[PDB]
């Protein structure tokens, strides 16, 4: 009835990463966090615990330099939809390859890694 990944989204403090694969939101394996395909588009949700018990959300949609239009647009839309699912309490961030904000890059201790290639376009 509803997307399983939305049901997983923003329930626990931490970092969640999904990749856009053929007009769908797919989870990235945890052991591959920090490694992004330059030919794909990703969605990243950082969750933080507050004193009052509520959760803070930051949504960064990352766009590879070689990512296709369907992937870039999907990431954007997914971000809006995931923001609305989270009562709109999340702040959205557009992260382009090579101009990532300090906040985004700061999520990764061992640093941001780029990889060539990526999943095929949905077009």
């Amino acid at each position: 009835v509803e997307h399983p990944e939305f049901l997983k989204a923003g329930k626990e403090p931490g970092l969640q990463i999904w990749r856009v694969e053929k007009f769908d939101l797919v989870p990235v394996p945890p052991n591959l966090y920090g490694d992004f395909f330059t030919g794909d588009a990703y969605v990243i949700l950082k969750t933080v615990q507050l004193r009052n018990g509520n959760l803070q959300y930051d949504l960064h949609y990352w766009l590879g330099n070689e990512c296709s239009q369907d992937e870039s647009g999907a990431a954007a839309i997914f971000t809006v939809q995931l923001d609305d699912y989270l009562n709109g309490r999340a702040v959205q961030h557009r992260e382009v390859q090579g101009f990532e904000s300090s906040t985004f890059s700061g999520y990764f201790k061992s640093g941001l890694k780029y990889k060539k290639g990526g999943v095929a376009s949905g077009f």
Binding site: H3, F23, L25, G73, A75, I77, T79, D83, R94
Partner: protein, 367 residues
């Protein structure tokens, strides 16, 4: 397996296709012709077939300035779109439609009633055109300058949703520029007047015109040389020439006074639109000014805006005008993507819902 249909209605041109396609397979004029007053009449013609029969037809545009004005004709457009162009049964596919900003609530309901009652669709959704363009550019926050054939709009968008209070309308568009070109070409004795001769001039515009970075200075340097002069082959075989008209014509976008309009230019209208928005987001607006529509296809338009807006904006404010090459179809492409998403499968307005709630349901299901 079963993909959905996407239709981007326009004041001048219809864009239709199937979701998952990177482009619309069908593009035809939004015109409807009927006999002014023997055999297969037939009764009503549409698109190119109507323009090929101007002699016995009173042509009409169902959409005026991005807004429907004739629903009997609008229904005919959609009929032709499904059965003649797309060759797809409406009852067999979901249908994503588009609408202008500040579209009256009455037209939204009407457009919904037709889809369910006339064409018996299983599903339906409506989306704001500019919002789809921003999505196609891969952005959730930014300000879109949509300029087509009948209307121009500036609409700021923040975290996916637009800001109605800051949306600005403008009754200056490509067709007015076409009419303007026909008028100034009389400085060469060229007498274009007929609705047929209006379509050939439209092509001259789309082929030769360009935006001058500095109008007053461009006029000076162009008057000296001849490189500004370009030739154009009329369909009969005759060859005319066009010079400074190439940038005088699309200058009306920045100086509506050329058309006899007290309205403001697009650079100023874009500026005011952003000014109406909350301060905390203006940076993201200035840094993501996105263009869409055919009228924004003029060569060197981004270079003019980028410098004209900086003149008005704070000196510190970084400014980026985005001009995607595919921006003639950016709206449709946004629809194709959105309606292909796995999450959108449950955002459709279903038949069951319409029968239970009627046309008024669109207000709550679409944004």
């Amino acid at each position: 397996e079963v993909q959905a249909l996407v239709i981007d209605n326009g004041s001048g041109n219809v864009k239709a296709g199937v979701a998952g396609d990177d482009a619309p397979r069908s593009v035809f004029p939004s015109i409807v012709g009927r006999p002014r007053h023997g055999m297969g009449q037939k009764d009503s013609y549409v698109g190119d077939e109507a323009q090929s029969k101007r002699g016995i037809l009173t042509l009409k545009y169902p959409i005026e300035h991005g807004i429907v004005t004739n629903w009997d004709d609008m229904e005919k457009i959609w009929h032709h779109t499904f059965y003649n162009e797309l060759r797809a049964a409406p009852e067999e596919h979901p249908v994503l439609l588009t609408e202008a900003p500040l579209n009256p609530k009455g037209n939204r309901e009407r457009m919904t009633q037709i889809m369910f009652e006339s064409f018996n669709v299983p599903a339906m959704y409506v989306a704001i055109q500019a919002v789809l363009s921003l999505y196609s550019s891969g952005r959730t926050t930014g300000i879109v300058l949509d300029s087509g054939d009948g209307v121009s709009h500036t609409v700021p968008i923040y975290e996916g949703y637009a800001l109605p209070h800051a949306i600005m309308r403008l009754d200056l568009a490509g067709r007015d520029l076409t009419e303007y070109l026909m008028k100034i070409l009389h400085e060469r004795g060229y007498g274009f007047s007929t609705s047929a001769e209006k379509e050939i001039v439209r092509d001259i515009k789309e082929k030769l015109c360009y935006i001058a970075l500095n109008f007053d200075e461009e006029m000076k340097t162009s008057e000296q040389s001849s490189d500004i002069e370009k030739s154009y082959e009329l369909p009969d075989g005759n060859i005319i020439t066009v010079g400074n008209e190439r940038f005088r014509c699309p200058e009306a976008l920045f100086q509506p006074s050329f058309l006899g309009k007290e309205a403001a230019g697009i650079h100023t209208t874009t500026f005011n639109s952003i000014k109406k928005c909350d301060v905390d987001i203006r940076k993201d607006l200035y840094g993501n000014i996105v263009l869409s529509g055919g009228t924004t296809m003029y060569e060197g338009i981004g270079e003019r805006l980028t410098r004209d807006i900086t003149t008005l904006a704070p000196s510190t404010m970084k400014i980026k005008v985005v001009a995607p090459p595919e921006r003639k179809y950016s709206v449709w492409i946004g629809g194709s993507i959105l309606s292909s998403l796995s999450t959108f499968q449950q955002m459709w307005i279903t038949k069951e819902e319409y029968d239970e709630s009627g046309p008024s349901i669109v207000h709550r299901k679409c944004f």
